[PDB]
Amino acid sequence: TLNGGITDMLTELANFEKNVSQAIHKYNAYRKAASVIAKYPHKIKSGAEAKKLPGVGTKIAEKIDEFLATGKLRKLEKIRQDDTSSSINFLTRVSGIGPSAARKFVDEGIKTLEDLRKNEDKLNHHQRIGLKYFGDFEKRIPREEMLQMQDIVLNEVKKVDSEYIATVCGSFRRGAESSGDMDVLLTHPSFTSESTKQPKLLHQVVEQLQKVHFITDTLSKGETKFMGVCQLPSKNDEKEYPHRRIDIRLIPKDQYYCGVLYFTGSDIFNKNMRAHALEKGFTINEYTIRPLGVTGVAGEPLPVDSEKDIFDYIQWKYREPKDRSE
DNA sequence: CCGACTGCGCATCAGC
DNA sequence: GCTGATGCGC
DNA sequence: GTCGG
Ligand SMILES: Nc1ncnc2c1ncn2[C@H]1C[C@H](O)[C@@H](COP(=O)(O)OP(=O)(O)[C@H](Cl)P(=O)(O)O)O1
Ligand SMILES: [Cl-]
Ligand SMILES: [Cl-]
Ligand SMILES: [Mg+2]
Ligand code: NA
Ligand code: NA
Ligand code: NA
């Protein structure tokens, strides 16, 4: 990629501030800076040039000057040498371990992958499954496997009830050649903003996917969100596929377009789009777009009949999923 | 300068 | 138990 | 850490 050095540097700084400093705004600021530079269709030749971009200010511009001149950042060099920082950054790579638990473990002398395996009784359930599939969860998913996975999920959902609709979102819907996980949007005519005519709607789908050994583990589960682990079946003598993260989101069917807009992302595109909505006087979530009145209180849901309607409200030209990879 | 920074489900904990 | 805050991940 | 007002 065109400014890969700079965006990697900024991502490492973002990870440091979230994981180690526990400074969530610095984290979001670095990620915004990285995203706008990754977008920029010119090889950046100075910090001043990059400062022209929205979300690059004085401090990042100076870091960019250091990096272009020397190929590195002293601040990052030091972070990498610091044992406490390095240990906490590593521990947050386990799904379910964040900045707080990572620092808790390191304070206790639990600093390595071995230390976790030796201390499984100190992990909650999510962290336990994350440790178990730590290696698997580092591997990306080729689109060819996502297509197999899509085909399994959609057919099994159909066998539970043919009125379900399951839509694979995330990077897959944006056309990516590889995905980090599988995100499935689900709807059913019984569950709308106005009524829930049948419960267990998500449960029945999860149960059927466990029955056929597609879903292998559960990280968390509720009435509308499932987060867990799945695996493609392998053939005779074939090495097994890696285990994969899967998230299933049950959205009221009349709220499908806000739901699919949300679950298609990217996360930074969503953040940017919701920022713009506020500037235009609306608030967007995965259910509705609503105005902000005189008090900045969210009013009543606006009528939405397409993803593009959402764009129309905030005065953005429609962007196809493949152009939302920010 | 400096207040605001996207929005929310599920798990866990704390205080009653 | 419930409620609200926090942790974590999406 | 950045920025609109
Ligand atoms: N912090 C956030 N704020 C708003 N929307 C978010 C969000 N995080 C995620 N979403 C929305 C927007 C996301 O697109 C959707 C899925 O989240 P996933 O973490 O799986 O992101 P992806 O795009 O699929 C990644 Cl490129 P990969 O999974 O291939 O590694 O959820
Ligand atoms: Cl901060
Ligand atoms: Cl809502
Ligand atoms: Mg995803
Ligand atoms: Na700027
Ligand atoms: Na983690
Ligand atoms: Na996900």
Coordinates of C-alpha atoms (C1' of nucleotides) and ligand atoms in Angstrom, one line a residue:
Chain A
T1 CA 0.0 0.0 0.0
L2 CA 1.1 3.5 -0.8
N3 CA 1.8 5.0 2.6
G4 CA 2.1 1.7 4.5
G5 CA 5.0 2.8 6.6
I6 CA 3.1 5.8 8.0
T7 CA -0.2 4.0 8.5
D8 CA 1.6 1.1 10.3
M9 CA 3.3 3.6 12.6
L10 CA 0.1 5.3 13.4
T11 CA -1.7 2.0 14.0
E12 CA 1.0 0.9 16.4
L13 CA 0.7 4.2 18.2
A14 CA -3.1 3.8 18.3
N15 CA -2.7 0.3 19.8
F16 CA -0.3 1.6 22.4
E17 CA -2.6 4.4 23.5
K18 CA -5.6 2.0 23.8
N19 CA -3.8 -1.0 25.3
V20 CA -1.2 0.7 27.5
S21 CA -2.2 4.3 28.2
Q22 CA -5.9 3.4 28.2
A23 CA -6.4 6.7 26.4
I24 CA -9.4 6.0 24.1
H25 CA -9.5 9.4 22.4
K26 CA -5.8 9.2 21.4
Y27 CA -6.6 5.8 20.1
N28 CA -9.5 7.0 18.0
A29 CA -7.4 10.0 16.8
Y30 CA -4.5 7.8 15.6
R31 CA -7.0 5.5 13.8
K32 CA -8.7 8.4 12.1
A33 CA -5.3 9.7 11.0
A34 CA -4.2 6.3 9.7
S35 CA -7.5 5.9 7.8
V36 CA -7.3 9.2 6.0
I37 CA -3.7 8.6 5.0
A38 CA -4.4 5.1 3.8
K39 CA -7.1 6.7 1.6
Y40 CA -4.8 9.5 0.3
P41 CA -3.8 8.6 -3.4
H42 CA -0.3 10.1 -3.2
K43 CA 2.9 8.9 -1.6
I44 CA 3.3 11.4 1.2
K45 CA 6.6 13.3 1.0
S46 CA 6.4 15.4 4.2
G47 CA 4.5 15.9 7.4
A48 CA 3.3 19.3 6.1
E49 CA 1.7 17.6 3.2
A50 CA -0.1 15.2 5.5
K51 CA -1.2 17.9 7.9
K52 CA -3.5 19.2 5.1
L53 CA -5.6 16.0 5.7
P54 CA -8.5 16.1 8.2
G55 CA -7.4 14.4 11.5
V56 CA -3.7 14.9 10.9
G57 CA -2.5 17.8 13.2
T58 CA 0.8 19.1 14.4
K59 CA 1.8 16.2 16.5
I60 CA 1.2 13.5 13.9
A61 CA 2.9 15.7 11.2
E62 CA 6.0 15.9 13.3
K63 CA 6.0 12.1 13.8
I64 CA 5.6 11.7 10.1
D65 CA 8.6 13.9 9.5
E66 CA 10.7 11.8 11.9
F67 CA 9.6 8.6 10.2
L68 CA 10.2 9.8 6.6
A69 CA 13.7 11.1 7.6
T70 CA 14.9 8.1 9.6
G71 CA 12.5 5.2 8.7
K72 CA 11.4 4.9 12.3
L73 CA 10.0 6.6 15.4
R74 CA 12.1 6.8 18.6
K75 CA 8.9 6.9 20.7
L76 CA 7.8 3.5 19.2
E77 CA 11.3 2.1 19.4
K78 CA 11.2 2.8 23.2
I79 CA 7.6 1.3 23.6
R80 CA 8.9 -1.9 21.9
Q81 CA 11.8 -2.1 24.3
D82 CA 9.6 -1.6 27.4
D83 CA 8.7 -5.0 28.9
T84 CA 5.5 -3.8 30.7
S85 CA 4.2 -2.2 27.4
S86 CA 5.2 -5.2 25.3
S87 CA 3.6 -7.6 27.7
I88 CA 0.3 -5.7 27.9
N89 CA 0.2 -5.3 24.1
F90 CA 0.7 -9.0 23.6
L91 CA -2.0 -10.0 26.1
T92 CA -4.7 -7.9 24.4
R93 CA -4.2 -10.0 21.3
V94 CA -6.2 -12.7 23.1
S95 CA -9.9 -12.3 22.3
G96 CA -11.6 -11.2 25.5
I97 CA -8.5 -9.7 27.1
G98 CA -8.4 -5.9 26.8
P99 CA -6.3 -3.2 28.4
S100 CA -7.7 -3.6 31.9
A101 CA -7.3 -7.4 32.2
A102 CA -4.0 -7.4 30.3
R103 CA -2.5 -5.0 32.9
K104 CA -4.1 -7.0 35.7
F105 CA -2.4 -10.2 34.4
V106 CA 1.0 -8.5 33.9
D107 CA 0.8 -7.1 37.4
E108 CA 0.3 -10.7 38.6
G109 CA 3.4 -12.0 36.6
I110 CA 1.2 -13.5 33.9
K111 CA 3.0 -12.2 30.8
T112 CA 3.3 -15.0 28.1
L113 CA 1.1 -17.4 26.2
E114 CA 2.5 -20.1 28.4
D115 CA 1.5 -18.2 31.6
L116 CA -2.1 -18.0 30.3
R117 CA -2.2 -21.7 29.5
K118 CA -0.8 -22.4 33.0
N119 CA -3.4 -20.0 34.6
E120 CA -6.6 -20.9 32.7
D121 CA -8.6 -20.8 36.0
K122 CA -8.0 -17.0 36.1
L123 CA -9.7 -16.5 32.7
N124 CA -13.4 -15.9 32.1
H125 CA -15.1 -18.0 29.5
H126 CA -14.5 -15.6 26.5
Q127 CA -10.8 -15.3 27.4
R128 CA -10.6 -19.1 27.7
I129 CA -11.9 -19.7 24.2
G130 CA -9.7 -16.8 22.9
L131 CA -6.6 -18.5 24.4
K132 CA -7.7 -21.8 22.9
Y133 CA -7.9 -20.5 19.4
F134 CA -5.2 -17.8 19.7
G135 CA -3.3 -19.1 16.8
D136 CA -6.4 -19.7 14.6
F137 CA -7.7 -16.2 15.3
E138 CA -4.6 -14.6 13.9
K139 CA -5.2 -16.2 10.5
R140 CA -7.3 -14.3 7.9
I141 CA -10.0 -16.1 5.9
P142 CA -9.7 -16.3 2.1
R143 CA -12.8 -15.2 0.3
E144 CA -13.1 -18.7 -1.2
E145 CA -13.6 -20.0 2.4
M146 CA -16.1 -17.2 3.2
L147 CA -18.1 -18.4 0.2
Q148 CA -18.2 -21.9 1.5
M149 CA -19.1 -20.5 5.0
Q150 CA -21.9 -18.3 3.5
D151 CA -23.3 -21.3 1.7
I152 CA -23.4 -23.4 4.9
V153 CA -25.0 -20.7 7.0
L154 CA -27.6 -19.6 4.5
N155 CA -28.7 -23.2 3.8
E156 CA -28.9 -24.1 7.5
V157 CA -30.8 -21.0 8.3
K158 CA -33.2 -21.9 5.5
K159 CA -33.7 -25.4 7.1
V160 CA -34.8 -23.9 10.4
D161 CA -37.3 -21.5 8.7
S162 CA -37.4 -20.5 5.0
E163 CA -38.6 -17.0 6.0
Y164 CA -35.3 -16.1 7.7
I165 CA -32.9 -14.0 5.6
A166 CA -29.3 -14.2 6.5
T167 CA -26.9 -11.6 5.0
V168 CA -23.1 -11.8 5.3
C169 CA -21.7 -8.4 5.9
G170 CA -18.4 -7.0 7.2
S171 CA -15.4 -6.9 4.8
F172 CA -17.0 -9.8 2.8
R173 CA -19.9 -7.6 1.7
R174 CA -17.4 -4.8 0.9
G175 CA -15.7 -7.2 -1.6
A176 CA -12.6 -8.0 0.4
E177 CA -10.3 -10.8 -0.8
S178 CA -10.0 -11.9 2.9
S179 CA -11.9 -11.4 6.1
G180 CA -11.0 -11.4 9.7
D181 CA -14.3 -13.0 10.8
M182 CA -17.8 -13.8 9.5
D183 CA -20.6 -11.3 10.2
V184 CA -24.1 -12.5 9.6
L185 CA -27.1 -10.2 9.6
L186 CA -30.3 -12.1 10.3
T187 CA -34.0 -11.1 9.9
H188 CA -37.3 -12.9 10.3
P189 CA -40.8 -11.5 9.8
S190 CA -41.8 -12.4 13.4
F191 CA -39.2 -9.9 14.9
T192 CA -40.0 -6.3 14.1
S193 CA -39.6 -2.9 15.9
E194 CA -43.3 -3.3 16.8
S195 CA -43.5 -7.0 18.0
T196 CA -41.6 -10.2 18.8
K197 CA -44.1 -13.0 17.8
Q198 CA -41.7 -15.8 18.6
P199 CA -38.7 -16.0 21.0
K200 CA -35.6 -18.2 20.6
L201 CA -35.4 -16.9 17.0
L202 CA -31.6 -16.5 17.3
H203 CA -31.3 -19.5 19.5
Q204 CA -32.9 -21.9 17.0
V205 CA -30.4 -20.8 14.3
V206 CA -27.5 -21.1 16.7
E207 CA -28.7 -24.5 17.8
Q208 CA -29.0 -25.8 14.2
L209 CA -25.5 -24.6 13.4
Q210 CA -24.2 -26.4 16.4
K211 CA -26.2 -29.5 15.5
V212 CA -24.3 -29.7 12.1
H213 CA -21.0 -28.9 13.9
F214 CA -20.5 -25.6 12.1
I215 CA -20.5 -23.6 15.3
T216 CA -18.0 -25.1 17.8
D217 CA -17.8 -22.6 20.7
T218 CA -19.7 -19.7 22.2
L219 CA -18.1 -16.5 23.4
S220 CA -21.4 -14.7 24.3
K221 CA -25.0 -15.1 23.4
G222 CA -28.2 -13.1 23.9
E223 CA -31.6 -12.5 22.3
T224 CA -30.1 -10.5 19.4
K225 CA -26.4 -11.0 19.3
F226 CA -24.3 -14.2 19.1
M227 CA -20.5 -14.2 19.2
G228 CA -18.8 -17.5 18.8
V229 CA -16.6 -19.9 16.8
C230 CA -17.2 -21.9 13.7
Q231 CA -15.2 -24.2 11.4
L232 CA -15.5 -25.5 7.8
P233 CA -15.6 -29.3 7.4
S234 CA -12.5 -30.9 5.8
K235 CA -12.2 -33.9 3.6
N236 CA -10.5 -37.2 4.2
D237 CA -6.8 -36.9 5.1
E238 CA -7.2 -33.2 4.6
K239 CA -5.7 -30.9 7.3
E240 CA -8.4 -29.1 9.2
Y241 CA -9.5 -25.6 8.5
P242 CA -8.7 -23.0 11.2
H243 CA -11.4 -22.2 13.6
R244 CA -13.1 -18.8 12.8
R245 CA -14.8 -16.1 14.7
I246 CA -18.5 -15.6 13.8
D247 CA -20.9 -12.9 14.9
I248 CA -24.7 -13.2 14.2
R249 CA -26.9 -10.1 14.7
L250 CA -30.7 -10.4 14.7
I251 CA -32.2 -7.1 13.6
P252 CA -35.9 -6.2 13.4
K253 CA -36.8 -6.8 9.8
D254 CA -38.3 -3.4 9.2
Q255 CA -34.9 -2.0 10.4
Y256 CA -32.9 -4.1 7.9
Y257 CA -31.3 -1.1 6.0
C258 CA -29.9 0.6 9.1
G259 CA -28.8 -2.9 10.2
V260 CA -27.0 -3.8 7.0
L261 CA -25.5 -0.4 6.8
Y262 CA -24.1 -0.8 10.3
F263 CA -22.8 -4.4 9.8
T264 CA -21.2 -3.7 6.4
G265 CA -19.0 -1.0 7.9
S266 CA -16.1 -0.5 8.1
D267 CA -16.0 0.5 11.7
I268 CA -14.2 3.7 10.8
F269 CA -16.6 4.4 7.9
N270 CA -19.4 4.0 10.3
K271 CA -17.7 6.3 12.8
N272 CA -17.2 8.9 10.0
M273 CA -20.7 8.6 8.7
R274 CA -22.2 8.9 12.2
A275 CA -20.0 12.0 12.8
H276 CA -21.4 13.5 9.6
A277 CA -24.9 12.7 10.7
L278 CA -24.5 14.6 13.9
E279 CA -23.0 17.6 12.0
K280 CA -26.1 17.5 9.8
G281 CA -28.5 17.1 12.8
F282 CA -29.2 13.3 12.8
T283 CA -28.1 10.3 14.8
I284 CA -27.6 6.9 13.2
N285 CA -27.4 3.5 14.9
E286 CA -27.9 0.0 13.6
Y287 CA -31.7 0.4 14.0
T288 CA -32.8 3.9 13.0
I289 CA -31.8 7.3 11.8
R290 CA -33.4 10.1 13.8
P291 CA -33.2 13.9 13.9
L292 CA -31.8 15.9 16.7
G293 CA -34.2 18.6 17.9
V294 CA -33.5 21.9 19.6
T295 CA -32.0 20.1 22.6
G296 CA -29.9 17.6 20.8
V297 CA -32.4 15.0 22.0
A298 CA -33.0 12.2 19.5
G299 CA -36.4 12.5 18.0
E300 CA -38.6 9.9 16.3
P301 CA -37.3 7.4 13.7
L302 CA -37.3 8.6 10.0
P303 CA -38.7 6.4 7.2
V304 CA -36.0 4.3 5.5
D305 CA -36.5 2.2 2.5
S306 CA -33.0 1.7 1.2
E307 CA -29.4 2.1 2.4
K308 CA -29.3 5.1 0.0
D309 CA -32.1 6.8 1.9
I310 CA -29.8 7.0 5.0
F311 CA -27.2 8.6 2.8
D312 CA -29.8 11.0 1.4
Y313 CA -30.7 12.3 4.9
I314 CA -27.2 13.4 5.8
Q315 CA -26.6 14.8 2.3
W316 CA -23.9 12.3 1.2
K317 CA -23.8 10.7 -2.3
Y318 CA -24.4 7.0 -2.0
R319 CA -21.3 4.9 -1.5
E320 CA -21.3 1.2 -2.6
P321 CA -20.1 -1.2 0.0
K322 CA -16.8 -1.7 -1.8
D323 CA -16.1 2.0 -1.4
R324 CA -16.6 2.0 2.4
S325 CA -13.4 0.2 3.3
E326 CA -12.0 3.0 5.5
Chain B
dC1 C1' -9.0 28.0 23.9
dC2 C1' -11.7 23.7 24.8
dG3 C1' -15.8 20.6 24.7
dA4 C1' -16.9 16.8 22.1
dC5 C1' -15.2 13.1 20.0
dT6 C1' -20.3 6.9 16.9
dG7 C1' -23.1 3.8 18.9
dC8 C1' -24.5 -0.5 21.3
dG9 C1' -25.0 -6.1 22.9
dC10 C1' -23.4 -9.1 26.3
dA11 C1' -20.5 -10.2 30.5
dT12 C1' -19.0 -9.0 34.8
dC13 C1' -18.8 -6.6 38.9
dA14 C1' -20.4 -3.4 42.9
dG15 C1' -23.6 -1.7 45.8
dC16 C1' -28.1 -2.3 47.8
Chain C
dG1 C1' -32.4 -10.4 42.5
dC2 C1' -32.1 -5.5 40.3
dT3 C1' -29.5 -1.3 38.7
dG4 C1' -25.9 1.1 37.0
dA5 C1' -21.0 1.3 35.7
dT6 C1' -17.2 -0.8 33.5
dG7 C1' -14.9 -4.2 30.2
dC8 C1' -14.7 -5.9 25.8
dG9 C1' -15.8 -6.5 21.2
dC10 C1' -18.7 -5.6 17.0
Chain D
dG1 C1' -4.6 14.0 19.3
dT2 C1' -7.5 16.9 16.3
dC3 C1' -10.7 20.5 15.4
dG4 C1' -14.9 23.6 14.7
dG5 C1' -16.6 27.7 16.3
Ligands
LIG1 N1 -16.4 0.4 16.8 C1 -17.5 0.3 15.8 N2 -18.4 1.2 15.6 C2 -19.3 1.1 14.7 N3 -19.5 0.0 13.9 C3 -18.6 -1.0 14.1 C4 -17.6 -0.9 15.0 N4 -16.8 -2.1 14.9 C5 -17.4 -2.9 14.0 N5 -18.5 -2.2 13.5 C6 -19.4 -2.7 12.4 C7 -18.8 -2.4 11.3 C8 -18.1 -3.6 10.8 O1 -17.9 -3.7 9.5 C9 -19.1 -4.7 11.3 C10 -18.3 -6.0 11.5 O2 -17.3 -5.8 12.5 P1 -15.9 -6.4 12.3 O3 -15.0 -6.1 13.4 O4 -16.0 -7.9 12.1 O5 -15.3 -5.6 11.0 P2 -15.0 -5.9 9.5 O6 -15.3 -4.7 8.6 O7 -15.7 -7.2 9.0 C11 -13.1 -6.2 9.5 CL1 -12.3 -5.5 8.1 P3 -12.7 -8.0 9.5 O8 -13.7 -8.7 10.3 O9 -12.7 -8.5 8.1 O10 -11.3 -8.2 10.1 O11 -19.5 -4.3 12.4
CL2 CL -7.7 10.0 25.6
CL3 CL -33.2 3.4 17.8
MG4 MG -15.9 -8.7 10.3
NA5 NA -5.2 18.3 9.3
NA6 NA -8.2 -8.9 23.2
NA7 NA -17.5 -9.2 13.8

